[PDB]
Design a binder for this molecule. Sequence first.
Ligand SMILES: Nc1ncnc2c1ncn2[C@@H]1O[C@H](COP(=O)(O)OP(=O)(O)NP(=O)(O)O)[C@@H](O)[C@H]1O
Ligand SMILES: Nc1ncnc2c1ncn2[C@@H]1O[C@H](COP(=O)(O)OP(=O)(O)NP(=O)(O)O)[C@@H](O)[C@H]1O
Lengths: 460, 452
Amino acid sequence: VLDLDLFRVDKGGDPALIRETQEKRFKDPGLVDQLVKADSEWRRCRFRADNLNKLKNLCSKTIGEKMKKKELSFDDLTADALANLKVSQIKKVRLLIDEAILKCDAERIKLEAERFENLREIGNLLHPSVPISNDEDVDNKVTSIWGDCTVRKKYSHVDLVVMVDGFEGEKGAVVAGSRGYFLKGVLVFLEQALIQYALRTLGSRGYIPIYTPFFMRKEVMQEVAQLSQFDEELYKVIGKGSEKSDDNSYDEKYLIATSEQPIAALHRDEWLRPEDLPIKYAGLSTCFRQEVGSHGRDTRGIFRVHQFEKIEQFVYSSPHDNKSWEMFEEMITTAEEFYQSLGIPYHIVNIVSGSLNHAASKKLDLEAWFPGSGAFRELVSCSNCTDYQARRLRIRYMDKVEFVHMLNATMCATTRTICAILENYQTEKGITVPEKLKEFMPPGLQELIPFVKPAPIEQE
Amino acid sequence: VLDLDLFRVDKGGDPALIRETQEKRFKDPGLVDQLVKADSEWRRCRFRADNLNKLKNLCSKTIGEKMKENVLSFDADALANLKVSQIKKVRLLIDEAILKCDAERIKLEAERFENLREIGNLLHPSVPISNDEDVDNKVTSIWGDCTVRKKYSHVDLVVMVDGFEGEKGAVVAGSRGYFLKGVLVFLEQALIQYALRTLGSRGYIPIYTPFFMRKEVMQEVAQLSQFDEELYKVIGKGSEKSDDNSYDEKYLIATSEQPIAALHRDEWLRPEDLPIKYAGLSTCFRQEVGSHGRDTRGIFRVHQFEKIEQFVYSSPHDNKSWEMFEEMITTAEEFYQSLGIPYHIVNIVSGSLNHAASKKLDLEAWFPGSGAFRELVSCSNCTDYQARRLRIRYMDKVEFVHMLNATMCATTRTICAILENYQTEKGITVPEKLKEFMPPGLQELIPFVKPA
RNA sequence: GGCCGGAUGAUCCUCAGUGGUCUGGGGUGCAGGCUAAACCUGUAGCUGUCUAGCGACAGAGUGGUUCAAUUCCACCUUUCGGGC
RNA sequence: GGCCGGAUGAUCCUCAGUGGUCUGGGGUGCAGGCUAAACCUGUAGCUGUCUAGCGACAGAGUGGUUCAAUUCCACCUUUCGGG
Ligand SMILES: Nc1ncnc2c1ncn2[C@@H]1O[C@H](COP(=O)(O)OP(=O)(O)NP(=O)(O)O)[C@@H](O)[C@H]1O
Ligand SMILES: Nc1ncnc2c1ncn2[C@@H]1O[C@H](COP(=O)(O)OP(=O)(O)NP(=O)(O)O)[C@@H](O)[C@H]1O
């Protein structure tokens, strides 16, 4: 949520720059114009109600002084000092006044919701470095690489996961209903190894490991999610809403798609002290995405699925200076040092504003090389959400309120990384366990993961 | 689901023994009587429809040979003699007569399955016959040192460690919600790591299960009460297209048991490898509506948690299923003794025993700080009950496999258990086995950075 | 946990009044006439809206009652108490 | 991706035929005969009901036209052919 004083030309800001950022974000403007109109209308009815309340006070004052002495025409907007009037005359006015403040009360109760309806779907301010386009496959500014992204092995991550016999998809489709899977055996330990290391990595950096709830009520979710996320991403969960045998009511909930949302809402409506402001968080959570926007893409593998575990970097920081951006760079550098230490070739990709969602100001996502698949695949996505969500969740820094900047970046998607190491470490007998991962693996697997099953695709 | 030939006195079984088991399970009978009536009715209408189609076949046979408007007679006899116009007029009334029966049968099959759905498994004679667990529970062993106390509840300790923020968890999840943070995460991660490696050392297959299961399958692996006061319903798009505005109801799992059971639904299983082990790792989701105002400050009974479970497919022949059952509870015993926690084995009475289980031995562990025993483990032998429901087969005369399930470890409850049983004045001492998987700085002990 | 209670949120702090737009003892600190201390006056915070600005007006938990509520009442947030 | 065409499911292989509860030519696994192979003859998978048992009847993806649908049109899923 952007600050409201930005729309007022009376204040420092201008709506023209907002329209520009809307066009550059590739979201159709006009919502800005409706915001401006509803705003100015909420200025009118506010001044009306304030003046009607001022006259409301002026009436009883006349009623008070005249009553200390003793014991039918309209003049609505011409509300003078005017002592002279009967108590019976003044009392008759209050009725018409009350109805006049009521119509404005409804007009304001509808205006506030109308303004918030548009403001809800207005994106954050972009950083000048962000590429201005809509096609990522074209205008993505690649900004570094590492390892050995010139080799291939010819063995898809769909195939290897069957040859290892750590995957039964046909049954997972029976249970969960398409894309469902049963991760079994060695692949479990490997994942458990990843989580174990990744956490210890962030723990070595100075992050606070936090296991988050996998669902959040509803009211909170709306504040930390745009419409599209509710439409084609989040799984709704209906609960009893009351732990009593008597109550037959319900309370709508939703499953999280990331640790980002609970960790963000962890410090909702707070006062954060600058004495410790560089606050780090390492969110461990299973993540649930409907992924409705895709159909017939990565259908045989486990790269894009409905359920998975994923460790998250989440950092609260101070808005002052560009120390938020320096922390942003420090975070992506940490992820770089991480996937470097893992020994996987990758390249940094700058996502265009067209694909950038509302909250983020700048989104640098990492794509990793798949030698067996012969492609690059988004394995990370760092984001600087700035004060956008911080103003929405009302998390504070006197006077003239300042909001902190909030960020998020996936340390590791346990199922995609799984595919990544499956292809990049293969041999003729099986997948060699990376030197770092050998630490957490059990004996028998610590050497390498063997193939106890042939290639999934036989023929006639 | 029990076998249907048990109700037929024509077959080997008798419904009198079923009524007895219903009374002993403390579920009101009469559903057995309704089962029997609907059954015999489904025998009548089946015989009706079978004879009516036999006659339906006999009609066209006459029509066929004669071919190589005359109303006739009353309404099976010999055939012969009769016009093709006479016979053709009969088929209409017949068709309506088979239709009324078709509806009567389509309602009878669902009516019978409605009652059979809520009929419990056959109990094992060892099972205590009562309804109050706090009274008639037969304890069968113990270990460790269940005579000591420390005076420090698992509610306070989790705050003193500063690995818990409940007031915010209640804001997000809505009561009982929690944010497990810091050292408590590693400890949990240590548990999972060890527990898996333990079962992996035993010869179990670690399996990460889906946390939701369509709907149709669920109805087969869950009774009514579970749908009423336990499982969280999840509404999904049902189609990954921008065009489809439909929905498909789902539910969240309360145990790994349900996905692992449904993993081999409708299969042919070979005796060559029948002793099949499974070690199901999964987050578990329970509404826990049946409780309110019980363990409200702590994290013993919550809505969400991770939980590793033993799941074993076995052969029905001999009592090798029961021997495997004993082997499994013995494995859990060897596990928690290796953890070094005082406990005692409790035999749950039939009154609290659900439909699926034939015998349910649950482990209660000692809480020195709380001064009580708490349910952490829950071994169950579901036998062929679910295996007949999920149609998991073994020539001739079909035989069903016996299925079992037993929690290896509840990561949040066991967390409380080790929180109380390993406390010192500075903090909780890390168990000798757990020191292996902990990070340096914590490997010694978990300190208190917050007061009570 | 239960009642019966009190306090309570947003005018510098505190005790307390009072249905008349508020009053008063008393207090820390602020500006200064005035004779370190003493005595007098005067001032006091946040939000919203109006003006370029000085400035003014509108808000005091959600509501009810009344022309009018800080007080009379209801109910909520938190806090203490006669207590069990 | 959408078009002019391909198959399906529940009858041991296949070929084709064919509105009468199917037919025929030839080839895998049991059984039997004559005497390694060939040849000769019968059978075949599952479900449900009925007699206590022999055995028989009912079911072949759902649904219309026909008395009768392997056969002729409609629909479902999956997998396959040239583009
Ligand atoms: N199905 C998934 N499984 C695991 N991680 C995922 C999945 N979808 C998205 N992510 C994570 O999201 C991060 C970046 O993608 P993000 O932009 O958040 O969503 P996105 O644009 O949907 N990704 P995708 O849905 O695959 O196109 C990746 O680094 C992943 O780690
Ligand atoms: N709320 C819970 N938290 C952790 N584990 C649970 C919970 N409920 C059941 N379990 C697991 O289920 C097994 C024993 O409980 P169970 O036999 O299912 O009934 P229970 O103890 O009545 N359910 P509950 O009312 O939560 O106590 C153990 O393996 C437990 O760890």
